[PDB]
Design a protein around this nucleic acid. Structure first.
Ligand SMILES: Nc1nc2c(ncn2[C@@H]2O[C@H](COP(=O)(O)OP(=O)(O)NP(=O)(O)O)[C@@H](O)[C@H]2O)c(=O)[nH]1
Ligand SMILES: [Mg+2]
Lengths: 38, 426, 176, 209, 121
RNA sequence: UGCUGAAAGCAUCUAAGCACGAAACUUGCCCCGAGAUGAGUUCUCCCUGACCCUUUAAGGGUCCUGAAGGAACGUUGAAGA
RNA sequence: CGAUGUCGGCUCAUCACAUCCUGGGGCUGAAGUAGGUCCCAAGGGUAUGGCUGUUCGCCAUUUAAAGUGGUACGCGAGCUGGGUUUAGAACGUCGUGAGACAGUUCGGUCCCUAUCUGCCGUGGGCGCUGGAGAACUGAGGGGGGCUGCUCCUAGUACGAGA
RNA sequence: GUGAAGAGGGAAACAACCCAGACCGCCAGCUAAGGUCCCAAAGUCAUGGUUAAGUGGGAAACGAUGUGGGAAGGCCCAGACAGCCAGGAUGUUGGCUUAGAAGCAGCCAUCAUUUAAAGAAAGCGUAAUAGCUCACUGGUCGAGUCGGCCUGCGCGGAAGA
């Protein structure tokens, strides 16, 4: 994963989510897509 | 101070092969330096038969001549082949007006005009840095004259010694950034841990056709032209081999006589691939009389960069011009540090290159003639899956005979995973 | 919103019992109240389980629909149980039951044991498998994975407890 | 559990059959008696006061003796405390002693350590010597660099300097019991006890075990 | 022991006296050495064993001027400081033969090869 | 990293509400510590005399009492400038 | 500029966290071995020698680690005086010269008994509502915090092997 | 334009900002900028709207089912949207490739059929062959549903001695 200040997405299964204040987002294509703290 | 000196200007050129003992650059290869530099060539001033001087490198009179030649023909710069110590440039400047540059700063200038990858950027500007750090040292004089000559209260350490430390800090800084880099490409090299790691590397002068052979062997896009620095940046692409299938390739930059010291020191990152490389493929030109020398040129740097212990494979490329021979195997011995008969732009010589190679890297050719009864779809499977059946011949009642030749690690991953009661492979 | 206003309907065997915000839920074997209700004025009638936001809350149908989903889960709980097939696989591994403690074997020197909080029990059709059975739909699966937690199965051969069937990542890079 | 007030009477060298030579401090454990009990009604903490040793029976004062009136009088050289509520014990004095530990393993031990009076640095702590050659004018053994120039223009309160040392309470936490001895009220402990000869030591069991 | 400090080679293999240079183990152990291995520079030599001038090597203490505690108030003291040369890699005694008796206190590991090949404790 | 779980019928580690979670956090050890001007606890022990005038939260004065306890000095200390 | 003593070392620490290890996690081109990054983390801890005035840098051998940087480039009313900048003299070199040079070498004086502050100990006065004498509780404060290496688990899970 | 050479009040402390040019007294009054829960002078003033962060009370390119506001546009009671019931087709495993390729080693063609429906194909799988899911639709269920645009006010970016 990363903390890329820009987030976007990396598959079609990717989906933005809120958790806590933090803007998480995940896929399942590969986990590595896990953007967050954008 | 990452600053660049321009290439592409009018120049009084001065050169002297005519020194008598070290010799070097008939001129023409230096002219090529000039050429790919894009220098606005003007005239070729040349001196005579001298040992090098504490003076103005060359002789007094000729020096005066080049000075005047500048002042009249209006050269933008006194290019001056063959290296000098900074004061030499200094006294030379007193007799001129313009920037002077030795062979070195030329080569750096062109080098930097060629930089495109960020890696190349750092190692370049590094070489630029280390080089210029020396030359700056006399230049205090003006700066001193304006300074007043006494009144250094506060500092004990003298100025410019200060500046010396500055550039030291630059240096360490640069390499510092270089660190994570070599680590990077090294992380790429962790893949070189997999046991199945053929790893060739090519070598020669620039215009050793390196780009070309690499082209045809790879079916890949690597441009090639008369100019020096016809390649920059290492370049990976995989290739076939009869006995390890996969086979990583990475082109190196082409060489010259007397390539700069600190260049290499910055350049160890780029060549860090060469070191590990399991085999030094070495193309050589076939048109130049320069032949021997170039080998002697190449050997030079090979020495300083280790791994000249590596087995090598010469390719007398550029057989086209010569019609040297039909392309052939050329066992120097059973050992094969072989000469190979090529003209890369035609590249007609390849199959012998690969075949000879096929001899040169292995360690298990006990082949087996495998067989099964209707239970072989899985065999054909594995064989296409990994490397090769040598031969597929089906036969009665689904009993089917085959021949296969693999390196042993295969033999045991196979003997393990499969029941291998088929037991022709061990 | 959707289900949030969908009535729950109380099954005849089951006995719902409103008491303040919470609702005791005696049943076929379950009998509790996971629910607690900050806002929504959920209420019994014939079987009628009222919802819809009460005052002002914004959490309105959120919390409410949540409440339905809960009790509706809950009553189904007081009917019966839930999470199962909490499998483990790979060589040398095994598991067992006793009392409420559960054996597990994962290459560790110390034997793997944890004891269930009640409302759920288990069984061993094989050491390979632990079947679970709990009155209330949350805690059972939660703790089930919490049982998995000791060893999230390893990608390169799937060793490690695997919660339910659950196809997982399966890469084969940097091997031999 | 509880400790007792005994005292130092000379370090020695006891032997086994291996005779490895366990260094062995010896604390005498005289019989105690309970000066008073406290409870969670009068006082904040369920507790037992005690004493041991003896005065000259004129050395005592009545306000002291009046406390000694109650729960009888062993006389003593002072009082000592034991907070407790897991445990339980008599208003009347103990006669108990070494037996309490006859089982136990690690006594705690705590003492005052011989006073060294005012003392130099490199002894209140461990400052290095500054050099005494090659110069070092006027300062062969000196307090180092305190402060740090401008900055908050003040000096902190860590980093001591010349000052008091010794004559001070200090535990040693864990200490093994070599051997309880009902014999002569002896009590045998390994290593050594801070506290000068002829002065008392508390000796409660292990705590940091 | 310690820094510098002359040492008598114990083994036959060594060529006379040598000097200590680093004390292996620790963040930086001070006054150390009695069985602990330590780095060495040969300074004084003749052809003899496979030892040579100018080399750096691992080694062991076997005899010691400050000597050794032994569990009964014992302090076995010696005269001079015997030492045994060792690969910096293979470790291993380099020596066919010890001279001079040494304590039981050095034993186990290869050192039983030493002391078994070394008369008198 | 989770469970359950809706707002958004599916989702969902979160909105609700539970499960985790570290040399860090607060305890847990030692030392200090009612000037903690919030000046606290328990235990012991002691003094329980008369008269006079002024303003009386007040005494002032006489007279008679001196207690436990404090010391002051001296003997000295592994206590100490 | 009616004077704020300047480089390096030497006693001495102090913080930041933009992490040197150890601590907790995400992914991996994470077989395991290990790394690489990223996140979280400031508790503690984090190389002696050679060479040079050196800081550095280089080198030899270590350790888990040899982290960054701030702090009148922390620290000369604490020292050090090797470099820094005087007068002595010399060399090369520029000057017709006296003279200079950041070109190098030789030699070459460190002052202050502490009022204030804050610092470390350790005191006496008065306080706490008749008076003492010993025992207290914990309102707050500080010290305290590293870790290698060995066998057992087990030649096991890993891997063709190693 | 003030200061210098101008005192007051306010922006916590403030020459150079906003307000205002002190002839001196007065325990009188009203206002200025600026303020009004406490230090602390006066509204816990009225009503309307937003903010969920302590923004306010340090900041960007930039990221996003934050929430207020808006215009318009698409779908639909012939019932969509979400989930749910089932189908997923014959040519034809397209020709080429090749051990094998065929919806998924490729390659280029990729149609014709049937039907509400189904692509020679969106993803998985196989050595390959054959499973597995949507695209497609019937049914189901019963009101809304899917977006882009504009826009106030907020989050993420955002570390110091
Ligand atoms: N006749 C002939 N010309 C050739 C041969 N090989 C290359 N050339 C030509 O000579 C030039 C070589 O270019 P290049 O391959 O870049 O040389 P290089 O050695 O690769 N230089 P660099 O490594 O810097 O790229 C091109 O014009 C190439 O076509 C050859 O075998 N014969
Ligand atoms: Mg090339």
């Amino acid at each position: 994963m990363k903390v890329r200040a820009s987030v976007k997405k990396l598959c079609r299964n990717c989906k933005i989510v809120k958790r806590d204040g933090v803007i998480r987002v995940i896929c399942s294509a590969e986990p590595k897509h896990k953007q967050r703290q954008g | 101070m990452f600053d660049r000196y321009d290439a592409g200007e009018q120049a009084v050129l001065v050169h002297i092969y005519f020194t008598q003992d070290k010799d070097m650059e008939d001129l023409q290869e230096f002219e090529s330096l000039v050429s790919s530099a894009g220098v606005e060539a003007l005239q070729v001033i040349t001196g005579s038969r001298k040992a090098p001087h504490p003076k103005y490198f060359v002789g007094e009179g000729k020096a005066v001549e080049i000075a005047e030649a500048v002042k009249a023909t209006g050269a933008s710069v006194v290019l001056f082949d063959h290296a000098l110590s900074p004061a030499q440039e200094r006294n030379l400047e007193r007799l001129c007006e313009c920037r002077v540059i030795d062979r070195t700063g030329l080569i750096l200038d062109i080098f930097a005009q060629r930089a495109r990858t960020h890696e190349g950027k750092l190692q370049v500007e590094l070489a630029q840095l280390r080089h210029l750090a020396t030359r700056l040292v006399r230049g205090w004089t003006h700066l001193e004259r304006q300074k007043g000559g006494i009144g250094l209260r506060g500092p004990g350490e003298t100025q410019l010694e200060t500046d010396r430390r500055l550039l030291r800090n630059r240096i360490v800084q640069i390499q510092s950034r270089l660190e994570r880099v070599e680590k990077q490409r090294e992380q790429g090299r962790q893949s070189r841990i997999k046991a199945d790691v053929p790893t060739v590397s090519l070598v020669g002068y620039t215009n050793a056709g390196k780009s070309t052979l690499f082209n045809r062997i790879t079916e890949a896009r690597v441009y090639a032209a008369d100019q020096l620095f016809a390649t920059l940046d290492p370049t990976l692409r995989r290739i076939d081999v009869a006995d390890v299938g996969e086979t990583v390739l990475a082109d190196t930059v082409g060489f010259i006589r007397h390539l700069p010291h600190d260049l290499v020191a910055a350049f160890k990152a780029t060549l860090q691939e060469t070191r590990q490389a399991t085999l030094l493929l070495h193309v050589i030109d076939a048109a130049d009389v320069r032949v021997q020398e170039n080998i002697e040129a190449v050997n030079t740097v090979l020495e300083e960069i280790d791994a000249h212990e590596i087995p090598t494979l010469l390719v007398m490329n550029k057989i086209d011009m010569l019609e040297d021979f039909e392309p052939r195997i050329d066992r120097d011995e059973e050992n094969k540090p072989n000469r190979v008969w090529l003209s890369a732009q035609t590249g007609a010589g390849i199959p012998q290159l690969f075949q000879a190679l096929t001899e040169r890297l292995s360690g298990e050719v006990a082949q087996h003639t495998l067989r099964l009864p209707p239970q072989e779809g899985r065999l054909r499977s594995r064989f296409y899956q990994l490397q090769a059946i040598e031969k597929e011949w089906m036969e009665e009642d689904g009993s089917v005979s085959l021949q296969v030749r693999m390196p042993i690690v295969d033999w045991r991953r196979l003997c393990k995973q499969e029941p291998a009661l088929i037991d022709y492979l061990i | 919103s959707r289900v949030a206003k969908a009535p729950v309907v109380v099954p005849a065997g089951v006995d719902v019992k409103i008491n303040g915000q919470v609702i005791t839920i005696k049943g076929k074997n379950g009998e509790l109240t996971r629910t607690l209700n900050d806002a929504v004025e959920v209420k019994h009638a014939d079987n009628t389980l009222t919802f819809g936001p009460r005052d002002g809350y914004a959490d309105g149908w959120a919390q409410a629909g949540t409440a339905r989903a809960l009790l509706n889960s809950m009553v189904i709980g007081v009917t019966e149980g839930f999470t199962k097939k909490l499998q483990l696989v790979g060589v040398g591994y095994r598991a067992a039951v006793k009392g409420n403690v559960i054996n597990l074997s994962l290459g560790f020197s110390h034997p793997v044991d944890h004891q269930l909080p009640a409302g759920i029990t288990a069984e061993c059709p094989t050491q390979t498998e632990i079947v679970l059975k709990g009155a209330d739909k949350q805690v059972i699966g939660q703790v089930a994975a919490d049982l998995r937690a000791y060893r999230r199965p390893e990608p390169y051969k799937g060793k490690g407890v695997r919660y339910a069937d659950e196809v997982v990542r399966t890469k084969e890079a940097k091997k031999k | 559990m509880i400790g007792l007030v005994g005292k130092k009477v000379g370090m020695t060298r006891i032997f086994t059959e291996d005779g490895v030579s366990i260094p062995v401090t010896v604390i005498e454990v005289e019989a105690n008696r309970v000066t008073q009990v406290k409870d969670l009604a009068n006082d904040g903490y369920r507790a037992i006061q005690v004493t041991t040793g003896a005065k000259k029976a004129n050395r005592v004062t009545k306000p002291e003796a009046g406390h000694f009136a109650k729960a009888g009088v062993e006389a003593g050289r002072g009082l000592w405390e034991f907070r407790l509520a897991e445990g339980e014990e008599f208003t009347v004095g103990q006669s108990i002693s070494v037996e309490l530990f006859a089982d136990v393993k690690k006594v705690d031990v705590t003492g005052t350590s011989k006073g060294k009076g005012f003392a130099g640095t490199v002894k209140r702590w461990n400052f290095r010597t500054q050099d005494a050659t090659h110069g070092n004018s006027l300062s062969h053994r000196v307090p180092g660099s305190i402060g740090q120039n401008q900055t908050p223009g003040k000096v902190f309160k860590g980093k001591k300097m010349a000052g008091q040392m010794g004559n001070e309470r200090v535990t040693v936490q864990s200490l093994d019991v070599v051997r309880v001895d009902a014999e002569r009220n002896l009590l045998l402990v390994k290593g050594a006890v801070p506290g000068a000869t002829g002065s008392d030591l508390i000796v409660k069991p292990a705590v940091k075990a | 022991i310690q820094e510098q400090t002359m040492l008598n080679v114990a083994d036959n293999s060594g060529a006379r006296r040598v000097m200590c240079i680093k004390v292996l183990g620790g963040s930086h152990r001070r006054y150390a050495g009695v069985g602990d291995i330590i780095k060495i520079t040969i300074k004084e030599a003749i052809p003899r064993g496979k030892v040579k001038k100018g080399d750096v090597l691992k080694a062991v203490v076997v005899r010691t001027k400050k000597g050794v505690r032994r569990p009964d108030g014992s302090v076995i003291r010696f005269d001079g400081n015997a030492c045994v040369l060792l690969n910096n890699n293979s470790e291993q005694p380099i020596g066919t033969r010890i001279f001079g008796p040494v304590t039981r206190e050095l034993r186990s590991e290869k050192f039983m090869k030493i002391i078994s090949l070394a008369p008198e404790v």
